[PDB]
Amino acid sequence: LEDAFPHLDLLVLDLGGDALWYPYAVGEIQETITGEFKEALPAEPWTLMPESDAQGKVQAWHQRTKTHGGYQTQTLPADDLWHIVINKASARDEVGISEVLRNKDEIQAFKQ
Amino acid sequence: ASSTPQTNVDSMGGGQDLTFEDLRDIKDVRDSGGQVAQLMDYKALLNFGEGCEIHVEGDDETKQLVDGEPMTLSEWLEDAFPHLDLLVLDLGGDALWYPYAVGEIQETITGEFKEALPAEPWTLMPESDAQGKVQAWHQRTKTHGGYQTQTLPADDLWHIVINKASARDEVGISEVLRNKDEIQAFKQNEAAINQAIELHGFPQRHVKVGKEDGAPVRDNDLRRVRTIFDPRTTDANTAYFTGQDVDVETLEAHNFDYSAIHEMDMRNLTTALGLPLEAGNVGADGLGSGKPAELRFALLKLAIKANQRSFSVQFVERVMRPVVRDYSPFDHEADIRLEINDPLEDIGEVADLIQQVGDYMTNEQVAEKLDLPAPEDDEVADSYRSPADMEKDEAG
Amino acid sequence: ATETQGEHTFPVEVLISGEELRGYTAGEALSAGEPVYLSGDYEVSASSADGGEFLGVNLYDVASGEPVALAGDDCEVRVEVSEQVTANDEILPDGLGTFETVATSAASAGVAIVQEGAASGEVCEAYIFAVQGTTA
Amino acid sequence: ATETQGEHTFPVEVLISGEELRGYTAGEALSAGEPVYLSGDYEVSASSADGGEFLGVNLYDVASGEPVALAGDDCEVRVEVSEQVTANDEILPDGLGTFETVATSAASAGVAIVQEGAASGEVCEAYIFAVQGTTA
Amino acid sequence: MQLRRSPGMRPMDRDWHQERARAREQAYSSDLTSQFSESEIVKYELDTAQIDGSDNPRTYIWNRTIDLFGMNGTDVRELRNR
Amino acid sequence: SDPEYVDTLFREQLLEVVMEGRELRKVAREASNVINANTRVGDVPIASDEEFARPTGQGAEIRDDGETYTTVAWNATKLTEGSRVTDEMRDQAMVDLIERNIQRVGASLENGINRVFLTELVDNAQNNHDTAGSNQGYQALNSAVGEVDKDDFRPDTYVTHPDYRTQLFNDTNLAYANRAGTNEVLRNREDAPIVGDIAGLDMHAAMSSATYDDGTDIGWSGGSETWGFSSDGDKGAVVYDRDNIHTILYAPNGQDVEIKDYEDPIRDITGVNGRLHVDCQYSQGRSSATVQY
Amino acid sequence: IHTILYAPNGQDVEIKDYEDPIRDITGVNGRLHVDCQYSQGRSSATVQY
């Protein structure tokens, strides 16, 4: 595991930081060309949102991103992405809460 | 699972993005000096000014004849980068000021490795592919008052990003541009205080001439009165004799708390740049001691660790490994690590620790903590009783 | 003075070249590109129809009593003419906020010279070379 | 126009002072120091005699259809005169590439004031103060 | 040359946007002459702002003389059926 | 700087964008041989045409008919575009005015190069194919190649008007996958690889309508032709040898367009100016044919 | 005999090279303020033909 995740101190700070800002941290698993493990690759969390079923679990991810030709949009299965939620609404919540959106009024009052 | 990113990223500038004009704004903030430049200079010195150390795990196992002489990979790297402390400070400073540090690998005429040579980061900006990896570098430079311009492939440049927007971001963020408004607000209030001190910080003489409702006095009359009360030819103990219809009034110095405005400005700027208030030569009562102190120095040390690791990983992965691969007889897949030293470690606190719990540390661990060469004899290095104790025991 | 590009109307940039610009007070409401003249101490008003009333052109729209930026002589300007004009024609304030030729006016000396001809009601390019006041 | 030093002939610098240098297309071949006027839209040609045709002096030799730099008002210039001139003479285009005095011409107003006198065929030093166009 | 007041530059001035936003928020009618200075009407091109009192919140806030029921200060465009 | 209005978070801020104007097609650097000149004026030497060896008696003196030479002169003209704004505008703008004026000045110089190139290319082509209505598509391109081939040069490039492109992509040769051998023109129109690989030509350079010098633009005196493909006698394409038309670029500093931002030393004006010098010259005008409507 | 040199800034000849970006011209200008005065004109003699 220490050889599989050599720079885990950086990854933990990036994902953990993202999961405090946004409702979730989210990312892929990737393989070398030969098909051995390469890395867990974080994705840009502001570009991604989950689609969930009636039981509350995530089934797909919807993504949109800036390109030279304006916005590009796509949908990915929950199979090969993974995600982490620090700020749950309830123990069964798998979408989470942004502490920033939650405190929008307090932040705007400070700025004003 | 996939072998390429299936998630997209924000890419290729389809306003509200980086330009060479913003790069020259950063250059202007850096070279215009004063307090803002000195704070960001202190930020560079904290992160990178304490110097570096190169480690390789299993370094002994690397030991090889390089050029008719034996070296380990650590010994070779320390010869490949003799003055690495200065390079780390320069690149680390640049990667805090600008979105990135950037540079070239270079070779001697014989083709042996010369140095890693940085390039002036305000002159260069990257072009990525859609997946957000840098494919080319666009460079413009002033010569003879105009922007002489070229483009380079990303093949043989290297670059380092401390402040990423996301873990995938190869373009990075300037902390100057991030806080552009706070910097401008600081410089605005500083100019305001300086001007207010000149106008209002000193008393000024107001000679009023003539009787109220009396005969009017004209400019050519006031000229002669001006020569009498002229501050430029007055001296400390000059005395005046007048009729009743000359009043020597004073515009007082008009009190305002410029010290409090300076303290407030410095608090805003230091907190925005992530420095403690104390770096700005300003103190605060409830913050100088106890848990209030311990917290802010913990926060500063954590910020330094995050920057140091972010730099170390990229410098090893994107400068050192390519150099080992292309100019060295060693295996570039070796476990190289670049340590950057702690700027605020108290050796006397470390000495207290060693005196308390040295009985649980190998002599090599003690030498590492105490910043010394490890002992020469492997058994004394590996052992837990002190080498002065082993020497007296062996003599006994 | 305006230019059409598809749906859009764009105002023309009045001042082509020059550094001879100065601040006055508006004696009345004025529109960008109008010729103006002195009507009180540092106060400018719209020029009347013949000679003796020109200091420069007003660079932006103003209400009465506002500060006015004015382009004087030594400036090249984009200005609307009320009649057809050609290169080398001397032109003069028209009294209507436009210019017209010296040839058409009752006067005999212009204030600007046309560098680029235009039809009636259309933007020419001209160089302002002179000013005119009360000679009697 | 030419200056002599020993055996050598040197071209004279046409411009002595001023920043009022402007660009036109040449309507014909022109020579440095020739007076010119607007022959077309941003196009200039050599001035004829007796006024109404002067925008400035050509600063360097050009062929027909080439872009040309021209010194206008507010410039001090070195220019060739076809008759004797003295300080305070007003001068204007002669119709021959030279200038002549207002006094000699049929015109009543000049375009440049002579600052240093010169003989017929010599280079005087003069200050340009007015353009002249078509007034009818 | 262009100045901040010059007619082709007005759309780039932050202040031209912000003051047109103010003018829409403070008006009660399209009758500009009553409500604004000649200077404001010219400087901010208020003839071309869609000023009509429809964006002023006081068009919709209740302000009755006697307030037994706490009805004053309620805004009709914040109700359930709006 | 001192902004009169602050920006609040969560994008509750003012709408802070500018919509672009029309952008003209830029191709001259790719569609011609570019010379980066050392001098603003200069010469390209041209050798005389091939001849036939002379039939001669046995033991007779061989006559001279040695190679002879001329030049085509370049005489590059300074294209310039500039802008000046007061410092109050720079401080109070919705977006960076210096960035926008730099981009505008750069674009205005590129459009300038393309006008000089297209006007030379259209006016000084020595051959012409007059379609007279009728077969204006692939057959006109083939015929125009025939006109250049009949002067013993081989063209490799064509430059095209929007009206000509429209006619060409309606041609049954290109619109039907059966006849084209690909559906790329039906799908991707001008971006189809066959459009840059037709009638032996290996490059297509698509022009704008406004590029050719009508002489209606200020400071420009027009070319001899009408650029278009709408009406009787318009010239709407040029088929030519890319190596025989030279765009000569000269700049006193560096190789290319020079943009200078500056502040006025007296008056609180900032400006940006652009310079480049360009000329365009056929080495061999016989290597080129226009297509006429 | 005293050659008195004056410069409002610096100490000697001011030589300014500047470029005007509006006209694409480098200007080279220079100035100095100079006077010359004897302190004692009796300390010199001309030789006259």
Ligand SMILES: [K+]
């Ligand atoms: K009339």
Ligand SMILES: [K+]
């Ligand atoms: K005569």
Ligand SMILES: [Mg+2]
């Ligand atoms: Mg009295």
Ligand SMILES: [Mg+2]
């Ligand atoms: Mg000028």
Ligand SMILES: [Mg+2]
């Ligand atoms: Mg002067």
Ligand SMILES: [Mg+2]
């Ligand atoms: Mg030649």
Ligand SMILES: [Mg+2]
């Ligand atoms: Mg013989």
Ligand SMILES: [Mg+2]
């Ligand atoms: Mg022959």
Ligand SMILES: [Mg+2]
């Ligand atoms: Mg032929």
Ligand SMILES: [Mg+2]
């Ligand atoms: Mg397609």
